[PDB]
Amino acid sequence: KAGNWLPGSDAPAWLPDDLPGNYGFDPLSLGKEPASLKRFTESEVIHGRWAMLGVAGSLAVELLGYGNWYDAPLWAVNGGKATWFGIEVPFDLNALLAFEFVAMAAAEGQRGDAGGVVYPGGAFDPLGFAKDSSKSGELKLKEIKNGRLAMVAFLGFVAQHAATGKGPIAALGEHLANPWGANFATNGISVPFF
Amino acid sequence: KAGNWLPGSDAPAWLPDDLPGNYGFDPLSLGKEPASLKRFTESEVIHGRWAMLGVAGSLAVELLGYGNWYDAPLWAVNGGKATWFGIEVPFDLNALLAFEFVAMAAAEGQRGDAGGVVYPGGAFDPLGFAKDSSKSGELKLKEIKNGRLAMVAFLGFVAQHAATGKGPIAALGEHLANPWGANFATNGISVPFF
Amino acid sequence: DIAGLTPCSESKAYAKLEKKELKTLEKRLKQYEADSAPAVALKATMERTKARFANYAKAGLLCGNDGLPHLIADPGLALKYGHAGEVFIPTFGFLYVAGYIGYVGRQYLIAVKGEAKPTDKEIIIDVPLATKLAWQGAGWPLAAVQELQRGTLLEKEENITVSPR
Amino acid sequence: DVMQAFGTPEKQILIEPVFAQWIQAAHGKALYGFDFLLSSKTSAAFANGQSLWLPGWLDAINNNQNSLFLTIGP
Amino acid sequence: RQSWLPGSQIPAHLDTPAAQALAGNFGFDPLGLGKDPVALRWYQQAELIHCRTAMAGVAGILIPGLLTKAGALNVPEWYDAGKVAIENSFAPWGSLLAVQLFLCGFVEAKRWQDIRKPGSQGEPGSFLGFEASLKGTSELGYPGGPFDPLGLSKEADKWADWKLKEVKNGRLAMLAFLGFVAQKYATGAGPVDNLAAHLKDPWHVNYATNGVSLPFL
Amino acid sequence: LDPQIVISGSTAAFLAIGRFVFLGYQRREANDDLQKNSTIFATNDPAGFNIIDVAGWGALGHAVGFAVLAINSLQGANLS
Amino acid sequence: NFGIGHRMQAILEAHTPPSGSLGAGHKGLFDTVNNSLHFQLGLALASVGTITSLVAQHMYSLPPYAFQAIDFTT
Ligand code: CHL
Ligand code: CLA
Ligand SMILES: CC(/C=C/C=C(C)/C=C/[C@@]12O[C@]1(C)C[C@@H](O)CC2(C)C)=C\C=C\C=C(C)\C=C\C=C(C)\C=C\[C@@]12O[C@]1(C)C[C@@H](O)CC2(C)C
Ligand SMILES: CC(/C=C/C=C(C)/C=C/[C@@]12O[C@]1(C)C[C@@H](O)CC2(C)C)=C\C=C\C=C(C)\C=C\C=C(C)\C=C\[C@@]12O[C@]1(C)C[C@@H](O)CC2(C)C
Ligand SMILES: CC1=C(/C=C/C(C)=C/C=C/C(C)=C/C=C/C=C(C)/C=C/C=C(C)/C=C/C2=C(C)CCCC2(C)C)C(C)(C)CCC1
Ligand SMILES: CC1=C(/C=C/C(C)=C/C=C/C(C)=C/C=C/C=C(C)/C=C/C=C(C)/C=C/C2=C(C)CCCC2(C)C)C(C)(C)CCC1
Ligand SMILES: CCCCCCCCCCCCO[C@H]1O[C@H](CO)[C@@H](O[C@H]2O[C@H](CO)[C@@H](O)[C@H](O)[C@H]2O)[C@H](O)[C@H]1O
C-alpha cells in the first residue's frame, strides 16, 4: 500500500494491497467489481502516460519560444503552415488527419487485441529496467505517481488558460511577479463575488 | 449474442442466440414467425450490401469532385452525355435501361432460384476469408454491423438532401464550420416549431 | 390569410354588420323615453352588441366575405397562427368533462353491482355514494390509464354473451 | 338557426373546410393561398406536367364559372 | 399517526406497511389516485423527480434574485432570463433544446428502465465498466453510488430523517414555483418585488387587492 | 430511333430471359369440352419452351418495345 | 385451355397473413363466391352502384358532351 489518502480512514477491501499506487481512494466505489477495476487499472496508466507526454510537450513548446500549447494548431484554421522546431512541415490538416487516424488505428488496434496488457515489456522495454520483477514494484509506483501528477497538471493548464487566456509558463511568471495580485482568486471567474 | 440494444432488457425468445447481429431488437415482434424471420434475415443482408455500395459510391463521387449522388443522372434528362471518372460513356438512357434490366434479371433470377442463400462462398469468395466457416462468425458480425450503418447513412443522405439540398460532403463541411448553427435543428424543416 | 380569409378587425363586411345591428336597435329606441325601462333594456343590448364585436375582433377571428367569423379546426394551422382557442383548446375541454361524467357513472355502476339488489340502486340513487364518486372523478384521466395498463378496464371475451354465428 | 333568429349572425359556428380546401389547392386552385403541388409554380409536379395537360387543367380549375372544383365554405 | 387533516379517515391504501414506509405519508390522497399499489409506486417516483427538479429550479430563481437585489449579482427576472441569455449565446435555442432532449433523453431512459426492472442497468458489459455503479440501492428513487459522493445515505440512523427533509422541502419548492407563475400574471413583477411590496404594506398589498384573483369581490 | 432494332432488340431480350432465366420459375408457379386442355402444345425445345410461351414473352417484348419508341417520339414534338 | 395464366383459387389460397391476423385468410372463398349467385350479385350491385355515383360526380364537373354545361335543366 502506497499510503492513505485520508488519515484515519479505512482502506476499501476491494482494492488489492499489491496494486501499484494504491492509497485506498475510492469514495464512490467505482472499482468495486473486479471486472470494472481491471478495465480502470489499464485506463489510468494509459491516461497517465499520455498526460506525461502531453504535459512535457506543452511545456517544451513554450520554453523553447514557439508559443503555448493552445495556439499550436491555429495555422490549420488561419491558413498558415505547420512548423516543428521552426522548420516548415509540408503536410496540411487533411493529410494529418488521415495519417494520424490510420497510424493510431493500427497501433491502438494492436493494443486492444492484447486484452489489457498494461506492462508489455519486451520491445517496449529495450533497456530492461523492468526486467526484474522485484524492482518493477517500485518503478510501477513511480510511473503511476508521476502520471497522476501529469494528469492534474494538464487539467491545470486547461482550467488556467480558460480563466486567464495565457500559457502555463506565462502564468507561472505572472504569479511569481505578484503572488498576491495574480492567482485564481483574482482572475474574476474562479471566485464569484469578487 | 452481439449485445443488448436496451440494457437491462430480455432478448425475445424467437431470436436465436447464434443469429449474426442479434442484439435482441424486435420491439414490434416482426420476426415472431420462424418463416418470416428466415426471409427477413436474408433481406437484411441484401439491403446492407447494396447500401454499403451505395454509400461508398455516393461518397466517392463527391470526394473525387464529380458532383454529388443526387446530380449524377441529370445528364440523362438535360440532353447531356454520361461520364465516369471524366471518361465519356457512349451509351444513352434507353440503352442503359436495356442493359441493366437484362443483366439484373439474369443475376437476380439466378439468386432467387438458389432458395434464400445469403453466404454463397465459392466463386463469390475467391480469397477464402470465410472458407473455414469457424471464424466466419466474427466476419459475419462485421458485415451486418457495417451494413446496418450503411443503411442508416444512406437514409441520412436522402433525408439531409431533402432538407438542405446539399451533398453529404458539402453538408459535413457546413456542420464543421458552424456546428451549433448548422444542423437538423436549424433547417427550418425537420422541427417545424424551432 | 388562411384559406383566403381575412381578420375580422380588418373586414369591411364585419364592420358593416355591426352598424346594421346597432342601427336596428337605434330605430326601436326612438319611440321610448330616455329613462323608461324599455330604453334602458335597449341600451343594455346595444352595449353588449358593441362589446361582442370588439371581443371577437380582439380574439383574432378570421372573417369570410360575408363578414362572419370562421373557425379553424386543423391543429397545425390553429397552433401556427394563434387560433388554438377556437376548436383545439375547446376540444380538450369537452373531452375532460365528458370523460368525467362517463367515468363517474361507470364507477357508480360497478360499485352498486356488489349490493343485494343492484337494480334498486339505479332507480333510487345512493346519493351519499354518488356524491363521493363525483368529487373523485376529477382524476379520471389518471385512473383510466391505470386500469388500461392493468388490464382491468375491459372484460374478457369468455364472459360476454353473443348470439349464434 | 337560433343565432339567426335572435338577429346575431356573427355568433354562429362556422367551421371552415380546410381539409377539403387543402385538397383543392393541391389540384391547382389558387383561391385559398395554400400554394403547394399544382398550386406551387416551383413544384416538380407543376413543372413535369406543364407541357402535357396542366395548362388546360389549370385554366379550367381556376375559372369560377364552371363546376370544376367549386369553391367551398362553411 | 400524523395526518394532513386531523380526525379525517385516512385512506386504507396509505395505511399499509408499504405505503407508510414512503417519506411524507400524511394520509393525503382524497382523489384515491394511489389506490392501485403499482400506480402508487410510479407516482412516488414522479413526486421525487418533481421535488428535486423544483428544488433546483426554485433555488435558481430565488438565490440569484436575492443576490441581485443585494447588488452582489445582476441577473434578470426568471421570466426574462431565457431571452437575455440567448442573445449572448453561441447557439440558437432550437439547437440548444435539441441537444438537451438527446442528453436528457439518454439518462431518463436509463432511469426509466431501472423503474421497470430495478437494478437492471448493472447488466455486465452494457456500459464501459461503469454499469456496476448503476444498479442503485434497494429503494427505488434513491440511486446512491456515484449520485451520493459524500456517502450521507450510508448512515442508517439518519436515513429516515434525510428522506423526510427532501420530500418536505421538495413539496414546498413545487408550491413556490406555482406561486411564481401565478404572481407573474397577477402582478407583473418579480418574486422578490412581490415580497418587498407585501412587507411594505401587508394589509393593502396582497392577492385580495391585486384585481385578478378575486373578481367577485 | 429505328423501329426494327428497338422492337427486335426488346423482343430478343424478353425471349432470352423467358427461356434462360425465368422459365424455371414460371413452370414452378404454373404447376364441358371447352374447358379442357385437349390440345397439348408439345415442343421439341430442350427446355420445354413452346409456342404459347413464345407468344407471351414475345408479346411483352413488343409492348415494351413500342413504349420506348412512343416515349422517345415525344421529344422534339410541337404543340404537345 | 393454353397452360398459362393464373388460377383464381390458387391466388386466394395464397393470401393468408403469416401472423394469423386474418385467421385462415381467403381459404375456401373461391367456392363460396363461385357457388353463390347472391354473393356474385351483391358484388356486382355494389360495384355498379358505386360506379353510377362516380358517373354522376364526374359528368357534372367534367362535362363530356358539347353544350351540356349551359343546358342547366339537363
Ligand atoms: C396536502 C396539503 C394539505 C392541505 C390541503 C391541508 C388542509 C387543511 N389542513 Mg392540514 N392540510 C395539508 C397538509 C397538512 N396539514 C397538516 C396539519 C394540520 C393540522 C394540525 C390541522 C390541519 C388543518 C387543515 C385544514 C384547515 C382549514 C382552514 O380553513 O384553515 C385556514 C387556514 C389558515 C388559517 C392558515 C392560513 C395561512 C396563511 C396562508 C399564511 C399567513 C402567514 C403570514 C406570515 C401571517 C402574517 C403575520 C401575522 C402575525 C398577522 C385544511 C382542510 C386543521 C383542521 O381543521 O384540521 C381538522 C388542523 O387543525 N392540517 C400537516 C402536518 C402533518 C400537513 C402536512 O403536509
Ligand atoms: C384529420 C386529418 C388531417 C388532415 C387532412 C390534415 C391536413 C393538414 N395538416 Mg394537420 N393535423 C391533424 C389532422 C389532419 N391534418 C392532426 C390530428 C394533428 C395533430 C396530431 C395535426 C397536426 C398538424 C401539424 C403539426 C401540421 C399540420 C399541417 C397540415 C397541413 C399540411 C401538412 C399535410 O400535408 O397534412 C396532411 C395530413 C396528413 C398526411 C395526416 C398527418 C398529418 C401530420 C399529423 C402533420 C404533418 C405536418 C407536415 C409534416 C408539415 C410540413 C411543413 C409545413 C410548413 C407544410 C394540411 C392542411 C401542417 C400545416 O400546414 O401547419 C400549418 C402542420 O405543420 N397538421
Ligand atoms: C484529470 C484527469 C482525471 C481525473 C480523475 C479523477 C480526479 C477521478 C477521481 C475519482 O475517480 C476516482 C479515482 C475514484 C472514485 O471513487 C472517485 C472519483 C473522485 C470520481 C485526467 C487527465 C488526463 C489528461 C490527459 C490524458 C492529457 C493528454 C494530453 C495530451 C496528449 C496533449 C497533447 C497536446 O498538448 C500537446 C502536447 C501540444 C498541443 O499543442 C496539442 C495537444 C494535442 C493539446
Ligand atoms: C418541476 C417544477 C418546476 C421546475 C422549474 C424549473 C426547472 C425552472 C427553471 C428555470 O427557472 C430557472 C431556474 C431560471 C429561469 O430563468 C428559466 C427556467 C427554465 C424557467 C415544478 C413542479 C410543480 C408541481 C406542482 C405545483 C404540483 C402540485 C400537485 C398537487 C397540489 C397535487 C395534489 C393532489 O395529487 C395529490 C397529492 C393527491 C390527490 O389525491 C389530490 C390532488 C389535489 C390531485
Ligand atoms: C428455332 C430456334 C431458334 C430461333 C428462334 C427464333 C428466331 C425465334 C423468334 C421468335 C419471334 C420473332 C417471336 C415473336 C413474337 C411476337 C409476338 C407474340 C408479338 C406480339 C405483339 C403484340 C401483342 C402487340 C400488341 C400491340 C399492338 C397490336 C398495337 C400497339 C400496342 C401493342 C404493342 C401492345 C434459336 C436459334 C434461338 C435456337 C434454335 C432453335
Ligand atoms: C354484406 C355482404 C356483402 C355486401 C357487401 C357490400 C354491399 C359492400 C360494399 C362495399 C363498398 C361500396 C365499398 C367501397 C369501397 C371503396 C374503396 C375502398 C375506395 C378506394 C379508393 C381509393 C384507394 C382511391 C385512391 C385515389 C384517390 C382518392 C385520389 C387519387 C387517385 C387514387 C386512385 C390514388 C357481400 C355481397 C360481399 C356478401 C357478404 C355479405
Ligand atoms: C429500383 C429497385 C427495383 C427493384 C425491382 C425488383 C423486382 C423484383 C421482381 C421479382 C419477380 C419474381 O422473381 C423472383 O421470384 C421468386 C422469388 O419471389 C424466385 O424464385 C424462387 O422463389 C421462391 C420463393 O422465395 C423459392 O422458394 C424458390 O426457390 C423459387 O421459386 C425467382 O427466381 C425470382 O426471379
CSV table of N, CA and C in Angstrom, one decimal, chain C residues 70-159:
chain,number,residue,atom,x,y,z
C,70,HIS,N,-65.0,32.7,-39.0
C,70,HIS,CA,-64.9,31.4,-39.4
C,70,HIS,C,-63.8,30.7,-38.5
C,71,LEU,N,-64.1,29.5,-38.0
C,71,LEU,CA,-63.3,28.8,-37.1
C,71,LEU,C,-62.3,27.9,-37.9
C,72,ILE,N,-61.1,27.7,-37.3
C,72,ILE,CA,-60.0,26.9,-37.9
C,72,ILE,C,-59.9,25.6,-37.0
C,73,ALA,N,-60.0,24.4,-37.7
C,73,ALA,CA,-60.0,23.2,-37.0
C,73,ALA,C,-58.8,22.3,-37.1
C,74,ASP,N,-58.0,22.5,-38.1
C,74,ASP,CA,-56.7,21.8,-38.2
C,74,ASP,C,-55.8,22.2,-37.1
C,75,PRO,N,-55.3,21.2,-36.3
C,75,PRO,CA,-54.4,21.6,-35.2
C,75,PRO,C,-53.1,22.4,-35.6
C,76,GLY,N,-52.6,22.0,-36.8
C,76,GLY,CA,-51.4,22.6,-37.2
C,76,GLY,C,-51.6,24.1,-37.6
C,77,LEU,N,-52.6,24.4,-38.4
C,77,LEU,CA,-52.9,25.8,-38.7
C,77,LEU,C,-53.4,26.5,-37.5
C,78,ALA,N,-54.1,25.9,-36.6
C,78,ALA,CA,-54.6,26.6,-35.4
C,78,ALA,C,-53.4,27.0,-34.5
C,79,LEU,N,-52.5,26.1,-34.3
C,79,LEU,CA,-51.4,26.4,-33.4
C,79,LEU,C,-50.3,27.3,-34.1
C,80,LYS,N,-50.2,27.2,-35.4
C,80,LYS,CA,-49.2,28.1,-36.1
C,80,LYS,C,-49.6,29.5,-36.1
C,81,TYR,N,-50.9,29.8,-36.3
C,81,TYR,CA,-51.4,31.2,-36.5
C,81,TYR,C,-52.3,31.7,-35.3
C,82,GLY,N,-52.2,31.1,-34.1
C,82,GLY,CA,-52.8,31.6,-33.0
C,82,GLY,C,-54.4,31.4,-33.0
C,83,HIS,N,-54.9,30.3,-33.5
C,83,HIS,CA,-56.3,30.0,-33.5
C,83,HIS,C,-56.6,28.8,-32.6
C,84,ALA,N,-55.7,28.5,-31.7
C,84,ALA,CA,-55.9,27.2,-30.9
C,84,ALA,C,-57.1,27.3,-30.0
C,85,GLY,N,-57.6,28.5,-29.6
C,85,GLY,CA,-58.7,28.7,-28.8
C,85,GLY,C,-60.1,28.5,-29.4
C,86,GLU,N,-60.1,28.3,-30.7
C,86,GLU,CA,-61.4,28.1,-31.4
C,86,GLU,C,-61.9,26.7,-31.4
C,87,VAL,N,-61.1,25.7,-31.7
C,87,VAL,CA,-61.5,24.3,-31.8
C,87,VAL,C,-60.6,23.5,-30.9
C,88,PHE,N,-59.3,23.7,-31.1
C,88,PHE,CA,-58.3,22.8,-30.5
C,88,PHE,C,-58.4,22.8,-28.9
C,89,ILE,N,-58.4,23.9,-28.3
C,89,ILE,CA,-58.4,24.0,-26.8
C,89,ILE,C,-59.8,23.6,-26.4
C,90,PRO,N,-60.9,24.1,-27.0
C,90,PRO,CA,-62.2,23.6,-26.6
C,90,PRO,C,-62.4,22.1,-26.8
C,91,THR,N,-61.6,21.5,-27.7
C,91,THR,CA,-61.7,20.0,-27.9
C,91,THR,C,-61.4,19.3,-26.6
C,92,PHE,N,-60.2,19.7,-26.0
C,92,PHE,CA,-59.8,19.0,-24.7
C,92,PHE,C,-60.6,19.4,-23.5
C,93,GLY,N,-61.2,20.6,-23.6
C,93,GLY,CA,-62.1,21.0,-22.5
C,93,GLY,C,-63.3,20.0,-22.5
C,94,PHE,N,-63.9,19.7,-23.6
C,94,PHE,CA,-65.1,18.8,-23.7
C,94,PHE,C,-64.7,17.4,-23.2
C,95,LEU,N,-63.6,16.9,-23.8
C,95,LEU,CA,-63.2,15.5,-23.5
C,95,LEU,C,-62.9,15.3,-22.0
C,96,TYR,N,-62.4,16.3,-21.4
C,96,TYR,CA,-62.2,16.2,-19.9
C,96,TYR,C,-63.5,16.1,-19.2
C,97,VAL,N,-64.5,17.0,-19.5
C,97,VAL,CA,-65.8,16.9,-18.8
C,97,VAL,C,-66.5,15.7,-19.2
C,98,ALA,N,-66.5,15.3,-20.5
C,98,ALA,CA,-67.3,14.2,-20.9
C,98,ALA,C,-66.8,12.9,-20.3
C,99,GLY,N,-65.5,12.7,-20.3
C,99,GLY,CA,-64.9,11.6,-19.6
C,99,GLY,C,-65.2,11.6,-18.1
C,100,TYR,N,-65.2,12.8,-17.5
C,100,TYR,CA,-65.5,12.9,-16.1
C,100,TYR,C,-66.9,12.3,-15.8
C,101,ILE,N,-67.9,12.7,-16.6
C,101,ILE,CA,-69.3,12.2,-16.5
C,101,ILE,C,-69.3,10.7,-16.7
C,102,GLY,N,-68.7,10.3,-17.8
C,102,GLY,CA,-68.7,8.8,-18.1
C,102,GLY,C,-68.0,8.0,-17.1
C,103,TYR,N,-66.8,8.5,-16.6
C,103,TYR,CA,-66.0,7.7,-15.6
C,103,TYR,C,-66.8,7.6,-14.3
C,104,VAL,N,-67.4,8.7,-13.8
C,104,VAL,CA,-68.1,8.7,-12.6
C,104,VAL,C,-69.3,7.8,-12.7
C,105,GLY,N,-70.0,7.8,-13.8
C,105,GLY,CA,-71.2,6.9,-13.9
C,105,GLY,C,-70.7,5.5,-13.9
C,106,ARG,N,-69.6,5.2,-14.6
C,106,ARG,CA,-69.1,3.8,-14.6
C,106,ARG,C,-68.7,3.3,-13.2
C,107,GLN,N,-68.1,4.2,-12.4
C,107,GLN,CA,-67.7,3.8,-11.1
C,107,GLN,C,-69.0,3.5,-10.2
C,108,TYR,N,-70.0,4.3,-10.3
C,108,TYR,CA,-71.2,4.1,-9.6
C,108,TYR,C,-71.9,2.7,-10.0
C,109,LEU,N,-71.9,2.5,-11.3
C,109,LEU,CA,-72.5,1.2,-11.8
C,109,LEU,C,-71.7,0.0,-11.2
C,110,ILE,N,-70.4,0.0,-11.2
C,110,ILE,CA,-69.6,-1.1,-10.7
C,110,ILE,C,-69.8,-1.2,-9.2
C,111,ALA,N,-69.9,0.0,-8.5
C,111,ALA,CA,-70.0,-0.1,-7.0
C,111,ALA,C,-71.2,-0.8,-6.6
C,112,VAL,N,-72.4,-0.5,-7.3
C,112,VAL,CA,-73.7,-1.0,-6.8
C,112,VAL,C,-73.9,-2.4,-7.3
C,113,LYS,N,-73.1,-2.9,-8.2
C,113,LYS,CA,-73.4,-4.3,-8.6
C,113,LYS,C,-73.0,-5.3,-7.6
C,114,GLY,N,-72.3,-4.9,-6.5
C,114,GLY,CA,-72.0,-5.8,-5.4
C,114,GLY,C,-73.0,-5.7,-4.3
C,115,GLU,N,-74.1,-5.1,-4.5
C,115,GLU,CA,-75.1,-4.9,-3.5
C,115,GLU,C,-76.2,-6.1,-3.6
C,116,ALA,N,-77.0,-6.2,-2.6
C,116,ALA,CA,-78.0,-7.2,-2.6
C,116,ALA,C,-79.0,-7.1,-3.8
C,117,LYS,N,-79.4,-5.9,-4.1
C,117,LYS,CA,-80.4,-5.6,-5.2
C,117,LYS,C,-79.8,-4.5,-6.0
C,118,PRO,N,-79.0,-4.8,-7.0
C,118,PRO,CA,-78.4,-3.8,-7.8
C,118,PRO,C,-79.4,-2.9,-8.5
C,119,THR,N,-80.5,-3.4,-9.0
C,119,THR,CA,-81.5,-2.6,-9.8
C,119,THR,C,-82.2,-1.5,-8.9
C,120,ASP,N,-82.2,-1.8,-7.6
C,120,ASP,CA,-82.9,-0.8,-6.7
C,120,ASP,C,-82.0,0.5,-6.6
C,121,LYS,N,-80.7,0.3,-6.7
C,121,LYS,CA,-79.8,1.4,-6.6
C,121,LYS,C,-79.7,2.2,-7.9
C,122,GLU,N,-80.4,1.8,-9.0
C,122,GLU,CA,-80.4,2.5,-10.2
C,122,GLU,C,-81.7,3.4,-10.4
C,123,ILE,N,-82.7,3.1,-9.7
C,123,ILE,CA,-83.9,4.0,-9.7
C,123,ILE,C,-84.0,4.8,-8.4
C,124,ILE,N,-83.4,4.4,-7.3
C,124,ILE,CA,-83.3,5.2,-6.1
C,124,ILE,C,-81.8,5.4,-5.9
C,125,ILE,N,-81.3,6.5,-6.2
C,125,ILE,CA,-79.8,6.8,-6.2
C,125,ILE,C,-79.3,6.8,-4.8
C,126,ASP,N,-78.2,6.1,-4.6
C,126,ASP,CA,-77.4,6.2,-3.4
C,126,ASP,C,-76.6,7.5,-3.4
C,127,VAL,N,-77.3,8.6,-3.0
C,127,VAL,CA,-76.8,9.9,-3.1
C,127,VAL,C,-75.5,10.1,-2.3
C,128,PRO,N,-75.3,9.6,-1.1
C,128,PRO,CA,-74.0,9.6,-0.4
C,128,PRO,C,-72.9,9.0,-1.2
C,129,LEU,N,-73.2,7.8,-1.8
C,129,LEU,CA,-72.2,7.1,-2.6
C,129,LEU,C,-72.0,7.9,-3.9
C,130,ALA,N,-73.1,8.4,-4.6
C,130,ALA,CA,-72.9,9.1,-5.8
C,130,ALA,C,-72.1,10.4,-5.6
C,131,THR,N,-72.3,11.1,-4.5
C,131,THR,CA,-71.6,12.4,-4.2
C,131,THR,C,-70.1,12.1,-4.0
C,132,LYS,N,-69.8,11.1,-3.3
C,132,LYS,CA,-68.4,10.8,-3.1
C,132,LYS,C,-67.7,10.5,-4.4
C,133,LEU,N,-68.3,9.7,-5.3
C,133,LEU,CA,-67.7,9.4,-6.6
C,133,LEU,C,-67.6,10.7,-7.5
C,134,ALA,N,-68.5,11.6,-7.4
C,134,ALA,CA,-68.5,12.8,-8.2
C,134,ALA,C,-67.2,13.6,-7.9
C,135,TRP,N,-66.9,13.7,-6.6
C,135,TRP,CA,-65.7,14.5,-6.3
C,135,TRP,C,-64.4,13.8,-6.7
C,136,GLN,N,-64.4,12.5,-6.7
C,136,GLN,CA,-63.2,11.8,-7.0
C,136,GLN,C,-63.0,11.6,-8.6
C,137,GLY,N,-64.0,12.1,-9.4
C,137,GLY,CA,-63.8,12.0,-10.8
C,137,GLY,C,-63.0,13.0,-11.4
C,138,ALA,N,-62.4,13.9,-10.7
C,138,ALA,CA,-61.5,14.9,-11.2
C,138,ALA,C,-60.2,14.3,-11.7
C,139,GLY,N,-59.9,13.1,-11.2
C,139,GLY,CA,-58.6,12.5,-11.6
C,139,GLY,C,-58.9,11.3,-12.6
C,140,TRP,N,-60.0,11.3,-13.3
C,140,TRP,CA,-60.3,10.2,-14.1
C,140,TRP,C,-59.3,9.9,-15.2
C,141,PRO,N,-58.6,10.9,-15.8
C,141,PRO,CA,-57.6,10.6,-16.8
C,141,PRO,C,-56.5,9.7,-16.3
C,142,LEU,N,-56.1,10.0,-15.1
C,142,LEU,CA,-55.0,9.1,-14.4
C,142,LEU,C,-55.6,7.8,-14.1
C,143,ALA,N,-56.8,7.7,-13.5
C,143,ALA,CA,-57.4,6.4,-13.1
C,143,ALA,C,-57.6,5.6,-14.3
C,144,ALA,N,-58.1,6.2,-15.4
C,144,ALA,CA,-58.5,5.4,-16.6
C,144,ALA,C,-57.3,4.7,-17.2
C,145,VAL,N,-56.2,5.4,-17.3
C,145,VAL,CA,-54.9,4.9,-17.8
C,145,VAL,C,-54.5,3.7,-17.0
C,146,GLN,N,-54.5,3.8,-15.7
C,146,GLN,CA,-54.0,2.7,-14.8
C,146,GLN,C,-54.8,1.5,-15.0
C,147,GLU,N,-56.1,1.6,-15.2
C,147,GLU,CA,-57.0,0.4,-15.5
C,147,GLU,C,-56.6,-0.1,-16.9
C,148,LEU,N,-56.4,0.7,-17.8
C,148,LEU,CA,-56.0,0.3,-19.2
C,148,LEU,C,-54.7,-0.5,-19.1
C,149,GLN,N,-53.7,0.0,-18.3
C,149,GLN,CA,-52.4,-0.6,-18.2
C,149,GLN,C,-52.5,-1.9,-17.4
C,150,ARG,N,-53.4,-1.9,-16.4
C,150,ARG,CA,-53.5,-3.1,-15.5
C,150,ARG,C,-54.4,-4.2,-16.1
C,151,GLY,N,-55.0,-3.9,-17.3
C,151,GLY,CA,-55.9,-4.9,-17.9
C,151,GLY,C,-57.2,-5.1,-17.2
C,152,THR,N,-57.7,-4.2,-16.4
C,152,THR,CA,-59.0,-4.3,-15.8
C,152,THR,C,-60.0,-3.4,-16.4
C,153,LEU,N,-59.7,-2.5,-17.3
C,153,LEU,CA,-60.7,-1.7,-18.0
C,153,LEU,C,-61.7,-2.5,-18.7
C,154,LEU,N,-61.3,-3.6,-19.4
C,154,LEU,CA,-62.1,-4.3,-20.3
C,154,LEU,C,-62.4,-5.7,-19.7
C,155,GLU,N,-63.5,-6.3,-20.1
C,155,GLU,CA,-63.9,-7.6,-19.7
C,155,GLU,C,-63.4,-8.6,-20.8
C,156,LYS,N,-63.2,-9.8,-20.3
C,156,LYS,CA,-62.7,-10.9,-21.2
C,156,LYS,C,-63.9,-11.4,-22.1
C,157,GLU,N,-63.5,-11.9,-23.3
C,157,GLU,CA,-64.5,-12.3,-24.3
C,157,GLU,C,-65.3,-13.5,-23.8
C,158,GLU,N,-64.7,-14.4,-22.9
C,158,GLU,CA,-65.4,-15.6,-22.5
C,158,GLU,C,-66.5,-15.3,-21.6
C,159,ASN,N,-66.7,-14.0,-21.1
C,159,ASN,CA,-67.7,-13.7,-20.1
C,159,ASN,C,-68.8,-12.8,-20.8
